[PDB]
Amino acid sequence: AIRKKLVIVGDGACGKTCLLIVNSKDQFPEVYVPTVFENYVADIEVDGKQVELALWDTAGQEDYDRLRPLSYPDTDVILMCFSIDSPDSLENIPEKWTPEVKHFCPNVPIILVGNKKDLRNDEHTRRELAKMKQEPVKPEEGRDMANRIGAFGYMECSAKTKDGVREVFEMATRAAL
Amino acid sequence: KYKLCTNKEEADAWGKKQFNKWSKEEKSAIRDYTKNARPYNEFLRMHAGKLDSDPTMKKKIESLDKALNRKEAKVNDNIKVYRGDDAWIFGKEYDNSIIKNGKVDREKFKEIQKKFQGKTTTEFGYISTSILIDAGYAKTRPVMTEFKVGSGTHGAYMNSDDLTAYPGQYELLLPRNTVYKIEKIYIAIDNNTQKEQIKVEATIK
Numbered sequence: 001a002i003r004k005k006l007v008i009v010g011d012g013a014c015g016k017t018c019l020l021i022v023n024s025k026d027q028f029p030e031v032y033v034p035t036v037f038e039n040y041v042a043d044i045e046v047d048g049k050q051v052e053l054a055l056w057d058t059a060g061q062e063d064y065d066r067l068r069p070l071s072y073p074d075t076d077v078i079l080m081c082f083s084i085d086s087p088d089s090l091e092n093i094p095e096k097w098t099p100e101v102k103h104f105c106p107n108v109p110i111i112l113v114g115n116k117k118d119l120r121n122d123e124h125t126r127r128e129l130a131k132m133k134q135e136p137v138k139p140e141e142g143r144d145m146a147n148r149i150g151a152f153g154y155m156e157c158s159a160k161t162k163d164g165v166r167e168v169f170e171m172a173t174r175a176a177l
Numbered sequence: 178k179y180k181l182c183t184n185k186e187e188a189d190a191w192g193k194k195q196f197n198k199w200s201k202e203e204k205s206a207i208r209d210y211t212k213n214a215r216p217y218n219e220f221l222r223m224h225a226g227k228l229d230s231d232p233t234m235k236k237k238i239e240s241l242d243k244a245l246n247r248k249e250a251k252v253n254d255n256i257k258v259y260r261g262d263d264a265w266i267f268g269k270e271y272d273n274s275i276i277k278n279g280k281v282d283r284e285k286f287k288e289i290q291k292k293f294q295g296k297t298t299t300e301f302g303y304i305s306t307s308i309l310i311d312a313g314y315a316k317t318r319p320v321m322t323e324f325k326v327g328s329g330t331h332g333a334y335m336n337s338d339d340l341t342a343y344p345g346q347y348e349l350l351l352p353r354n355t356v357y358k359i360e361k362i363y364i365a366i367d368n369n370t371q372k373e374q375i376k377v378e379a380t381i382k
């Protein structure tokens with residue numbers, strides 16, 4: 001078995017831990033949702049090869065930027081995440097997360113992940129966004145971003161509904177090999 | 178007087194002093210645990226230390242105990258080690274909203290103190306710690322615990338691939354059924370983030 005490392009990053013609240021949780025437990029967390037997820041080696045098989053992929057959850061908030069580097073050494077692939085719920089978090093792909101990850105994980109493959117895919121066609125969302133003259137990230141904006149920051153590829157998922165979750169980790173395993 | 182590792186250089190220096198000559202089986206037991214610890218620890222807590230329920234968990238837990246029970250699997254000196262926990266470590270009636278805007282719920286915090294401060298407990302699962310305060314989860318969880326670990330305590334130090342699926346964590350793993358006393362439960366303010374956090378001082382016994 002090939003052992004690989006995967007570190008997940010993105011703005012606070014953009015759904016990293018819930019992505020990791022749903023990915024293993026196969027159930028969205030409602031009441032006891034941790035800030036950072038416990039160690040978990042996901043066994044994934046892509047194209048005839050079994051990979052044991054260690055997943056590292058990180059804290060997205062600025063307060064933890066000093067501690068995040070401790071998670072970056074010998075990383076095989078980054079899940080860089082923003083919420084489709086929040087263009088603010090996407091703008092932070094190029095502004096905060098790519099510079100960080102490039103400096104610390106130079107040339108490490110990057111998979112751009114749009115979380116909360118379910119919130120794209122949500123009235124409440126669309127409406128609270130419209131208050132700031134914003135709207136939900138469109139797919140081609142994630143793709144555009146993915147190409148602009150040199151990502152391996154681009155994916156959208158919803159932990160809440162488990163839509164695309166499996167796919168994200170299959171892709172990460174592909175960019176880890 | 179307990180050794181405290183201020184940084185990477187110190188953790189490493191201390192780290193090399195530890196037994197590491199486990200047998201192959203002993204390394205595999207230890208590394209398997211790091212892969213996912215929910216399976217071990219949640220089983221032990223649910224079933225209170227009895228292993229009769231699950232043949233596989235039985236052999237897997239029995240194996241690790243042996244690795245951790247080796248005469249040479251001991252920490253030479255007295256050391257301070259750390260871990261973070263979520264609020265429900267103090268019971269299902271608590272979640273992480275117990276801290277809001279870096280403010281610890283005084284009311285909830287107090288009933289937690291009344292219930293646990295000064296308490297001697299026995300833990301059924303294994304006990305995962307870091308020798309480096311900044312490592313592991315101590316700064317990313319609502320409750321930080323500092324364990325004062327006495328000389329002679331059985332443990333495994335893990336910080337390389339042969340021993341852990343997560344190297345870089347500076348881990349000291351304590352055997353299961355370790356008794357410890359909660360000496361103090363309190364609130365301290367982070368020097369930097371300026372938020373509140375529940376700090377626990379405990380002594381291995």
Ligand SMILES: NC(=O)C1=CN([C@@H]2O[C@H](COP(=O)(O)OP(=O)(O)OC[C@H]3O[C@@H](n4cnc5c(N)ncnc54)[C@H](O)[C@@H]3O)[C@@H](O)[C@H]2O)C=CC1
Pocket residue numbers: 034038039210211212213214215218219222259260261262263264265266267268300302305306307312313314315343346347348349
């Ligand atoms: N906690 C830390 O800061 C450190 C964690 N680790 C790593 O993490 C893994 C174990 O650490 P955890 O994530 O704490 O695993 P764990 O199985 O001890 O904890 C899982 C969850 O259950 C809670 N919990 C733990 N003990 C409990 C108890 N007696 N009663 C009620 N709830 C309890 C924890 O707060 C956490 O939310 C190991 O595989 C190790 O590799 C390693 C070094 C330090």
Ligand SMILES: Nc1nc2c(ncn2[C@@H]2O[C@H](COP(=O)(O)OP(=O)(O)OP(O)(O)=S)[C@@H](O)[C@H]2O)c(=O)[nH]1
Pocket residue numbers: 010011012013014015016017018019029033034035036058059060061115116117118119157158159160161
């Ligand atoms: N609608 C919807 N909500 C989600 C989804 N995933 C997570 N959330 C919600 O968003 C909030 C943040 O999710 P969470 O996974 O904790 O973010 P995080 O990246 O771990 O945040 P942090 O640890 O860096 S502060 C939670 O309230 C969670 O319920 C999703 O897929 N769809």
Ligand SMILES: [Mg+2]
Pocket residue numbers: 016017018034035036037057058059
């Ligand atoms: Mg999180």
